[PDB]
Amino acid sequence: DLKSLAKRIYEAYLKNFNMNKVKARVILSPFVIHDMETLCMAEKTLVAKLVANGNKEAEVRIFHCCQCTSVETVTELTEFAKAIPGFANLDLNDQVTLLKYGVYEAIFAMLSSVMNKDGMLVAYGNGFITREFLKSLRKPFCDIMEPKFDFAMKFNALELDDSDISLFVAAIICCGDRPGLLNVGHIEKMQEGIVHVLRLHLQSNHPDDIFLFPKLLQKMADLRQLVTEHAQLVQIIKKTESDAALHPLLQEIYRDMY
Numbered sequence: 537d538l539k540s541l542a543k544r545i546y547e548a549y550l551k552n553f554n555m556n557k558v559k560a561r562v563i564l565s566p567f568v569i570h571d572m573e574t575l576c577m578a579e580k581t582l583v584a585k586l587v588a589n590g591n592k593e594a595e596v597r598i599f600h601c602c603q604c605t606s607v608e609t610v611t612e613l614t615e616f617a618k619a620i621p622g623f624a625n626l627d628l629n630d631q632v633t634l635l636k637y638g639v640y641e642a643i644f645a646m647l648s649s650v651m652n653k654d655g656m657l658v659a660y661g662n663g664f665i666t667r668e669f670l671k672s673l674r675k676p677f678c679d680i681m682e683p684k685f686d687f688a689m690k691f692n693a694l695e696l697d698d699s700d701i702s703l704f705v706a707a708i709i710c711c712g713d714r715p716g717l718l719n720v721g722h723i724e725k726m727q728e729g730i731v732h733v734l735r736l737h738l739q740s741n742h743p744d745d746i747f748l749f750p751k752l753l754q755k756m757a758d759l760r761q762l763v764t765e766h767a768q769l770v771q772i773i774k775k776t777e778s779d780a781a782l783h784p785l786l787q788e789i790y791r792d793m794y
């Protein structure tokens with residue numbers, strides 16, 4: 537029954553997220569964006585509407601694309617959350633709170649799947665932007681990217697697959713210590729259930745690493761810190777860059793988070 541639960545989560549993940557580790561890897565083994573010329577060419581083909589004006593600064597244009605991917609992932613994560621035992625039975629306000637505080641942690645966790653030490657896939661697997669090009673961007677835009685790569689490199693070293701990641705993301709969403717929850721007790725039990733499944737699955741899927749579970753619990757805490765830091769950086773950008781507008785949805789997610 538618990539082995540069945542793990543599969544249900546895995547199937548929901550495969551059905552709700554446009555990208556997964558297997559697909560990402562097939563592609564990585566795509567138009568390359570390594571400089572301004574290639575960035576511009578990529579934009580004209582992939583996000584034509586965004587460069588038809590005559591346009592925002594390259595850094596802001598990239599920042600907008602990053603935001604748009606987040607908005608899309610929020611929709612994917614919301615639909616995914618339904619296959620998690622008990623989630624749909626939670627109060628509507630609790631579901632919203634869980635999604636609000638968990639989306640960015642899940643985003644950076646899953647972002648690792650399309651990242652390697654040299655760069656990352658973008659625009660639904662149709663592009664590959666170099667890590668070095670992202671580092672080249674002027675401050676503070678170049679500071680948004682690198683920390684995510686740093687986390688990704690160590691996360692990817694854990695060699696998790698989609699069956700593991702699906703449960704990890706589920707566990708991230710099922711967090712009882714999120715601010716403003718109405719029914720903390722039911723959420724903690726829901727959490728305990730998912731974490732229990734995650735533990736048994738890692739034991740079965742990774743007999744070679746007896747520290748995998750504790751390692752992942754730590755990544756959960758690392759993600760929370762990574763997000764707090766990301767939120768601060770986004771705030772700095774929002775105030776000091778008069779041309780970088782924040783998407784309304786993300787603005788709502790960011791509100792009173794940290």
Ligand SMILES: CC[C@@H](Cc1ccc(OC)c(CNC(=O)c2ccc3ccc4cccc5ccc2c3c45)c1)C(=O)O
Pocket residue numbers: 569578579582583598599600601602603604605606607657658659660663665680681684770786
């Ligand atoms: C504003 C940051 C964002 C979170 C965030 C932080 C980091 C990060 O990759 C390091 C991504 C995902 N970032 C991306 O997916 C991404 C990056 C850079 C791009 C550069 C050129 C692009 C041209 C055409 C299409 C796309 C689509 C996505 C895309 C690009 C482009 C998202 C948020 O806070 O919502």
